[PDB]
Design a protein around this nucleic acid. Sequence first.
RNA 1: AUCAGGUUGAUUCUGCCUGACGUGGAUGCUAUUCUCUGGGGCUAAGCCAUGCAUGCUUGUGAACUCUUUGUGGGGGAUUAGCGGACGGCUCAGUGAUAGCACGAUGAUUUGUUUGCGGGAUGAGCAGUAGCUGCGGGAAACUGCAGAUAGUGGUCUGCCCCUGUGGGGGUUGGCAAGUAAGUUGUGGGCCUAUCAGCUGGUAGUUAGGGUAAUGGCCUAACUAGGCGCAGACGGGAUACGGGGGAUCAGGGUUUGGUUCCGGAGAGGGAGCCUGAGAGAUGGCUACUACGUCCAAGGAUGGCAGCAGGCGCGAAACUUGCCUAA
Lengths: 259, 164, 141
Amino acid sequence: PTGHRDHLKRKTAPKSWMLDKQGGTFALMPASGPHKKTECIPLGYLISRFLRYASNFKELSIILAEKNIKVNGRVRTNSHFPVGLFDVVSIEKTGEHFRVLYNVHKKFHLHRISSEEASYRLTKVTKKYENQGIPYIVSSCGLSIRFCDPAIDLGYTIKISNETSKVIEYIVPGPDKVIFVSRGKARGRVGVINTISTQGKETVYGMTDFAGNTFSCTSKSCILIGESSENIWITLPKERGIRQSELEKINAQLGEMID
Amino acid sequence: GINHRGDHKRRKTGAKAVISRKKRNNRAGSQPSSTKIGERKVTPVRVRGGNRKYKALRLDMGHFKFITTGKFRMAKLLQVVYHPSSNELVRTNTLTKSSVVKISAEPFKNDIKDVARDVDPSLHESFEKGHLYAIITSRPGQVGMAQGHVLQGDELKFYADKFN
Amino acid sequence: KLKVFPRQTGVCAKPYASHEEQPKRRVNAEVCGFKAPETAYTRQYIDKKCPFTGDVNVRGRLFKGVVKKMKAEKTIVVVANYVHYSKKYKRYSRRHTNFSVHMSPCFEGMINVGDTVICGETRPLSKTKSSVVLGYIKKAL
RNA sequence: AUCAGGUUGAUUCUGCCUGACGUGGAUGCUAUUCUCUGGGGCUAAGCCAUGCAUGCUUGUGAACUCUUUGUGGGGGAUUAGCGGACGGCUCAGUGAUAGCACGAUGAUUUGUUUGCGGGAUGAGCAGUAGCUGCGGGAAACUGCAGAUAGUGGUCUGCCCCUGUGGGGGUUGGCAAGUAAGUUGUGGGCCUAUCAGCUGGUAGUUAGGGUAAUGGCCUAACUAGGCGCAGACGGGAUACGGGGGAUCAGGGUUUGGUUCCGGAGAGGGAGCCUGAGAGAUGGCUACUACGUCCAAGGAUGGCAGCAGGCGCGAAACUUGCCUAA
């Protein structure tokens, strides 16, 4: 036990992938690349469980070797390629576009979009370095972009072209904005910033759902997706990320309990 | 071979060691290379990751720097006169880091004539016998070369009291 | 009894300089709330293991203790107190841990057996030392 | 959230012994069906007959071969490349150097994956696999001659550290992701008919070695370091957790065994190739037991899946599979 492992047992697969407990002993192992390993799903599951296109694996490998898929406007033919949050999946025949999201139950979700919305991507700026006489910035999906503004720093959200891969414009975080929580206890919930305070080298955002509930979370689990409550830069899913509590779910089915 | 683990040492309280593993190639080491003077010989070794070190077995022609003017010259190595740790490394003419060597003085003939025989008169007396003193700040067993600077003033007096 | 010529790692002076005009000693201000002593500026010593004028970085947890011994060269023994909870009997017990700590020479005539010190965590410094003294508090009479 | 029987001629007590309820192993009688879930761990980490458990891809095209024939085709040997460090089995060693929890790496390396960067169509000589012949040996294995791709030296240029001298190298990169190494503190197995223990032992200064910090190793010098809040020793069926059983509460007992971490391949050592091994379906030696021979040599590793012997109170098929 000093050499890398190449297999996944099925009990250890992440809960967001929604895999049945039986159905074999193994699960697809994702490859290295764009996103982290705890924040991606293999490409081959998206085409046979979330679209139910291929019923098999002999068929799923006829769809990928015929070059019919494009992640972020770029053809992919590998079933282990990893796909992450806010990524566009395009399918030429039967023209369609999807964006990869979460539920409020914290599972994955494919959300259909239009064509002039399929030329976007939102990411956070994490690193920044200079090499060979050029200034770079590093995305949160892992890319480097050269020759951006000199006034983009760690934390801002940037908009990537997705057909030339170049920055368009960005968002600086401050009160009266919108947020998507990409991980943690509160994954898949949208809010509106109220206060920004500090602690021992931390920043915490007080938030407020689109229904009145309150909220709070560090700045490492949040991406800005809007300028104000009616200026969001992507299309949200059907439910908008509310997460009604369990008191408020039985009254829907049972009414109130007045004295 | 040489191995750099500490699984075989007595404990902080003095208790005898208990070993439950064979040695690992993770922590393997080498025998000391002993760089002598004369007729350059350097060897490339293959190290972890596929990378490369250069292990000098013999060397001539250091690459020294005159500090007051800031110019590099390539001189010739004559002999070793002081090593701070072991003086059995001076009887053998072995070149480690921070050993003081006696160097040939011709290539610095332009540089030394910007200093008078005023406050440094001990630098001008050895120049007329034909040699200067230098000191090595590279690691000849790890990079395959000697590289240092010439002693003047404060340094040259501190070390001169050592090797007489 | 020095064996090499004394000079801080990082600065480089010139051979024929004056004793009043030559480079300045570089010092710090340590983990945010600890200022360097004043015997760190006005003193001559070379310590590569010193937190202020040295080459070590302090990234880790800070702890407190009581000076128990001062008998080796630049190394003291500090005792730290703590407590453990028993579940079956519903009570605590008092316990201690021993540390070997690096004391730089800028604390020469300051710490005595019985004071309290604040130490920081470093990379391994010897077989038993992995921490350093940052400040102290002299005992009250 | 419960009690019964038993010391007396009769009595009230103290006190243990026994019954009444679960659970893991072995065993007697007796048995119709289907559905889920288990089965050589304890004794011998004892010894093993026979079969199977690891091979693929070409910008590579030999022998041979076709065509009325040419910078033509078929054919498939060998070069070159990738993998065999994972998967599977077991619990001897290890009482904390392992494992779990929270930390440091500003002290480090990372093939395949992703996005950027980077690349000698110059001279001049050596020379090989397959292939075509002569052969040795009981075997297992092997030699010599002939002629050719890739290829290997040396100059030339290119790049690097320098320069009022010179000296090296032969194209090897950056950032993410994935993996790996190193390191701090803390935890109820039993034992004082175990009370004092420790010499690379505790520290300083220099160098070597390493991918990297460090007595990891060496030279010189100081005299330290741990302990009834149990040191240093010795014992028992000691792999650690996630977990299991019992059941008012508080507690007691157990975990060889699906998932994650470690360690090992009869016993010890030492190494090569490679991004990664101190590898055992890799190599070399000593050592336990061996096996085949024409006698001079050559060889073995089921704690992989079936199976056999042995051991014991104690545990299944030498089956079918180009489907999930």
